[PDB]
Amino acid sequence: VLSPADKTNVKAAWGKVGAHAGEYGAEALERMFLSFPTTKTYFPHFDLSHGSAQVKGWGKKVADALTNAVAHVDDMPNALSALSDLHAHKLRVDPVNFKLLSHCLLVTLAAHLPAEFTPAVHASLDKFLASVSTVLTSKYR
Amino acid sequence: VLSPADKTNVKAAWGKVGAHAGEYGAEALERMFLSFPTTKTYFPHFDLSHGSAQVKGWGKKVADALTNAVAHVDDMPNALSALSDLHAHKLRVDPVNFKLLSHCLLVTLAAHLPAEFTPAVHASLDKFLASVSTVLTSKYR
Amino acid sequence: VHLTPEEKSAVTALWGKVNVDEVGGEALGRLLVVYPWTQRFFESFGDLSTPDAVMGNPKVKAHGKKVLGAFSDGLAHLDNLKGTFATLSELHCDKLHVDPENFRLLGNVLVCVLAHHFGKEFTPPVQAAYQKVVAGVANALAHKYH
Amino acid sequence: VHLTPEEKSAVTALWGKVNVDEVGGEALGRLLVVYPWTQRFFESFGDLSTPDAVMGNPKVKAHGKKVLGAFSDGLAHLDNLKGTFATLSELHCDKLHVDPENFRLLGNVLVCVLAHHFGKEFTPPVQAAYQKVVAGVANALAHKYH
Ligand code: HEM
Ligand code: HEM
Ligand code: HEM
Ligand code: HEM
């Protein structure tokens, strides 16, 4: 579970991210596509080039969903329910990929949070993204 | 989440296993050691030889725990509480290994339940072992 | 990868007893039932509404035959799986957009099907050999992804 | 592994800036904090009770230096990672009994540390090159397991 310290750490880190959240979501997708090319199988309709507006648009929506999850950290399953449905029954992204995106989100946050990304905050963010991932895959079967 | 239909499928299939549950747990362990040798890193001072009393004893304890979980499927976190403490705080088996054992348990059941291992029962069993695995790693961090 | 001679012999011996069309249909159907997100490639295949509809679906059975027929032919080339599957790898990446995790899931399901079909004959050592094979095939089909 | 020209260059260039001692201490400490079940291998290392205790622990820092030193040495042999790590592979299996999943976890924490320390210079293409490397080193250290 997410402890109160985890929740505090996540809110502080995401609060520092602030208005850059959409940018960081896009950067995380780019990192994922370059690092883990199999993930490109889900985006054959995107221009994957650096600066792509499709990547930017996805990054914004993903960021806004994470912002909503952080705001609703005690009630994440309901906050993310429409996205759990979308991923389970339409997009059908293999659950193994959520660990890949989560790692790339962590790497992006690390690269942008010199002061905030302490070992404790890193641990909390890893648990938070694993929890979001669990929620998003909870309706797959 | 286990559906009510999953719970019915699991109780029926595990009921059929019956008194062979301990044997099947031991066979699953052997299957895992042979198919996925990295799992042997957790049993460095075990007698791993076919039919060993240590393998048979582990199989019987794992079987008893699964029987407890099936009987108490709506209350698995409390039912398995001591075992989730033991794995999280002492044994500290990397979570990836639970998928390996679960696959080997599923293969063992398939090999011994020709009548009962239908597609729907296979799905329910797979979900059940995944749920047990989740409970057993829930206190890891 | 890395079968011993006796493991190769064990694989070949068991496979000579396999009805490829039947096991292929059963393995693909079970994949779509046990891991239903794998249905994402098969919206054009008609009725997948229940486990029985999936297992009975003629297009699911036909695709299972096709997939397991290529798997079967590949067993003649256990020392060159990458070469044997390279052009199918490029296809699955460039045109079909199939996440190679699907190959691993199908491997899991195939092993469960062989266990179900062969019972006690599917011994722990035989399973270990087949695990090497399904890992090797999945790795080969994934190798030309980019 | 198979690095592009640009990737081997990217790896070498970043590594020239890495204080292997400091980064190794930091990566091992973070491993023990983020995935605390990994502490199972370091029972004699003293105080691991809190993040600050782990990060400040001299035995964690010392061991981190040794581990990343061996990693650093291997970067001179990116074409032959299996041969380069074979001896350490056998040690980690037969004597230390370390599940090779740990090598993967350490790789991902190292990538996180490189990103945290270098910031914007740890671009997506540089990360991709390092992901290939940490996967290659983990697989090389896993290779002699049996
Ligand atoms: C933290 C994890 C994730 C979150 C919060 C998330 C959230 C979202 C959101 C908010 C959208 C847009 C929904 C809409 O347009 O109505 C979306 C779409 C999508 N996501 Fe996820 N997602 C996650 C993980 C993943 C992963 C791991 C993949 C694949 C590697 C993936 C693949 C996709 C794809 C292909 C789309 C549709 C994009 C398009 O066609 O425009 N997602 N997701
Ligand atoms: C369905 C998943 C699992 C269940 C239900 C389970 C259950 C148990 C039980 C009942 C015990 C005996 C506890 C006692 O004697 O007090 C045990 C011990 C142990 N288990 Fe788990 N376990 C599971 C997964 C795993 C996995 C995946 C591994 C490693 C690959 C593992 C490694 C161990 C080890 C090393 C012991 C101690 C053996 C000894 O030295 O006696 N377990 N487990
Ligand atoms: C042992 C693993 C597999 C093998 C050997 C294999 C082989 C094949 C072959 C031989 C074809 C026909 C290519 C052609 O017509 O030129 C094919 C097509 C296809 N495969 Fe795979 N396959 C495997 C696994 C999978 C899996 C797991 C999936 C998805 C869950 C998948 C999805 C597809 C799709 C969507 C097509 C196109 C079918 C059509 O257009 O009717 N394959 N595969
Ligand atoms: C890049 C990955 C790794 C490399 C290159 C590596 C290398 C090494 C080296 C060179 C030593 C011997 C140090 C000496 O001369 O005293 C060693 C020892 C050891 N390593 Fe690893 N290691 C790696 C990852 C890990 C991980 C992830 C773990 C566990 C989480 C681990 C567990 C150990 C342990 C328990 C010892 C013995 C420590 C002791 O003396 O008590 N290694 N490793």
Side-chain angles (χ1 to χ4, degrees):
Chain A
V1 313
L2 299 173
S3 73
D6 289 326
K7 297 173 197 175
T8 298
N9 282 340
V10 171
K11 288 176 161 84
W14 203 247
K16 182 59 42 66
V17 166
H20 300 281
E23 176 197 331
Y24 297 174
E27 173 180 339
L29 182 61
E30 178 176 30
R31 290 176 179 284
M32 186 180 64
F33 289 147
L34 292 178
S35 280
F36 306 113
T38 58
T39 65
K40 297 198 281 187
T41 61
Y42 298 96
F43 301 86
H45 57 305
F46 277 25
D47 190 331
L48 311 176
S49 57
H50 178 74
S52 168
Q54 294 168 287
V55 167
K56 287 180 171 183
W58 181 96
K60 293 182 64 276
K61 290 165 190 296
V62 173
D64 293 351
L66 293 166
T67 295
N68 187 58
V70 167
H72 289 91
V73 79
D74 296 350
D75 230 276
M76 297 210 333
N78 180 65
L80 294 164
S81 187
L83 290 169
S84 296
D85 289 347
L86 182 70
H87 288 77
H89 298 308
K90 181 81 231 80
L91 303 172
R92 283 171 291 189
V93 171
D94 196 277
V96 299
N97 296 286
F98 290 81
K99 293 160 190 164
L100 310 177
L101 173 67
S102 292
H103 175 64
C104 291
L105 288 155
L106 279 188
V107 167
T108 302
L109 294 174
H112 287 281
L113 296 177
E116 287 73 26
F117 197 79
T118 63
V121 170
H122 173 177
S124 298
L125 285 160
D126 198 44
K127 288 178 67 178
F128 170 74
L129 296 171
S131 187
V132 169
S133 294
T134 294
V135 173
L136 286 178
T137 62
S138 62
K139 307 180 185 299
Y140 271 49
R141 59 175 177 169
Chain B
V1 324
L2 297 166
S3 74
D6 291 320
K7 296 176 189 154
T8 297
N9 288 343
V10 174
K11 289 174 185 283
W14 198 252
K16 176 53 81 191
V17 165
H20 295 278
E23 173 190 329
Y24 296 173
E27 178 179 331
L29 187 68
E30 179 171 59
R31 291 179 179 282
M32 184 179 68
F33 289 158
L34 295 180
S35 287
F36 307 107
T38 61
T39 66
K40 293 188 297 181
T41 64
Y42 296 101
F43 298 84
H45 304 125
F46 240 54
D47 176 11
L48 305 182
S49 59
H50 178 77
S52 80
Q54 281 173 293
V55 166
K56 292 184 171 200
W58 185 95
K60 286 179 192 297
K61 294 179 302 185
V62 169
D64 286 347
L66 297 170
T67 296
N68 178 22
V70 177
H72 300 95
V73 74
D74 301 307
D75 189 46
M76 292 203 279
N78 282 333
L80 297 183
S81 191
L83 277 178
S84 57
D85 288 348
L86 176 68
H87 289 75
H89 299 330
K90 296 194 172 71
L91 302 170
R92 285 169 292 176
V93 175
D94 193 278
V96 299
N97 297 282
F98 288 80
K99 289 171 180 315
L100 306 182
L101 177 65
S102 293
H103 173 68
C104 293
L105 282 165
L106 198 61
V107 169
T108 302
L109 291 169
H112 285 282
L113 302 171
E116 298 79 6
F117 200 78
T118 61
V121 167
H122 174 174
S124 295
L125 285 168
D126 197 43
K127 285 179 68 176
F128 167 72
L129 294 167
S131 290
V132 168
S133 294
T134 294
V135 173
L136 288 183
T137 61
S138 62
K139 298 172 183 180
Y140 270 48
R141 63 175 175 172
Chain C
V1 317
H2 212 181
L3 286 288
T4 59
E6 62 268 21
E7 277 177 324
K8 285 173 168 176
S9 294
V11 166
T12 297
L14 197 74
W15 200 257
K17 309 180 187 202
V18 167
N19 181 325
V20 177
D21 279 355
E22 295 187 333
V23 171
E26 178 81 7
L28 185 64
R30 279 182 188 255
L31 179 79
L32 270 55
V33 170
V34 171
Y35 310 108
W37 53 97
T38 61
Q39 296 174 24
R40 76 189 306 275
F41 305 101
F42 306 112
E43 290 283 350
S44 69
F45 279 26
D47 193 1
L48 304 172
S49 64
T50 71
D52 289 350
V54 173
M55 298 309 295
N57 184 303
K59 293 178 160 54
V60 170
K61 284 171 159 165
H63 191 58
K65 298 175 183 180
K66 178 184 294 183
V67 165
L68 206 69
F71 178 99
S72 182
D73 288 351
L75 299 182
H77 295 109
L78 290 167
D79 295 325
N80 184 32
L81 293 172
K82 282 186 185 184
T84 297
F85 286 111
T87 304
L88 278 177
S89 181
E90 304 187 302
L91 177 72
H92 280 76
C93 177
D94 294 344
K95 307 299 191 188
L96 308 179
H97 313 296
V98 174
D99 181 347
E101 179 66 14
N102 292 290
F103 307 139
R104 294 169 189 105
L105 296 177
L106 181 64
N108 291 344
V109 171
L110 176 61
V111 170
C112 291
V113 170
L114 293 173
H116 189 228
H117 181 82
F118 288 108
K120 69 190 306 283
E121 186 175 359
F122 195 65
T123 59
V126 172
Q127 169 187 359
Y130 272 91
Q131 296 285 173
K132 292 179 176 190
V133 170
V134 297
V137 175
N139 286 342
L141 278 162
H143 192 249
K144 304 304 178 302
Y145 283 58
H146 61 101
Chain D
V1 277
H2 197 258
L3 300 154
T4 70
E6 319 294 323
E7 284 172 334
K8 174 275 167 216
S9 162
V11 168
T12 299
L14 189 72
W15 200 254
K17 312 177 76 166
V18 164
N19 182 329
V20 181
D21 291 357
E22 307 271 31
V23 169
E26 178 79 8
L28 187 61
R30 286 189 182 241
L31 176 78
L32 297 181
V33 172
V34 177
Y35 311 108
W37 51 97
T38 65
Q39 295 169 22
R40 74 192 303 284
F41 301 106
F42 303 103
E43 290 281 358
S44 73
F45 271 35
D47 195 2
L48 301 173
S49 60
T50 71
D52 286 354
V54 171
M55 307 300 303
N57 183 309
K59 293 190 175 177
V60 173
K61 291 183 172 194
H63 192 60
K65 158 189 45 67
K66 297 176 191 156
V67 164
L68 208 69
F71 179 94
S72 181
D73 293 348
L75 299 185
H77 302 110
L78 288 171
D79 289 329
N80 291 281
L81 288 177
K82 284 175 191 309
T84 304
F85 289 103
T87 295
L88 290 177
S89 182
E90 299 166 17
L91 171 74
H92 278 75
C93 179
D94 294 342
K95 304 185 180 275
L96 304 177
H97 313 295
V98 171
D99 175 1
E101 192 65 25
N102 291 291
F103 307 139
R104 296 140 176 77
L105 293 179
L106 184 61
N108 294 328
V109 174
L110 175 63
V111 167
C112 286
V113 170
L114 294 175
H116 186 219
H117 185 72
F118 293 106
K120 182 153 155 168
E121 309 160 21
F122 195 66
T123 62
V126 171
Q127 177 187 352
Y130 274 89
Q131 294 285 171
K132 293 181 171 53
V133 171
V134 302
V137 170
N139 290 149
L141 284 163
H143 181 249
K144 302 295 194 172
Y145 278 62
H146 61 102

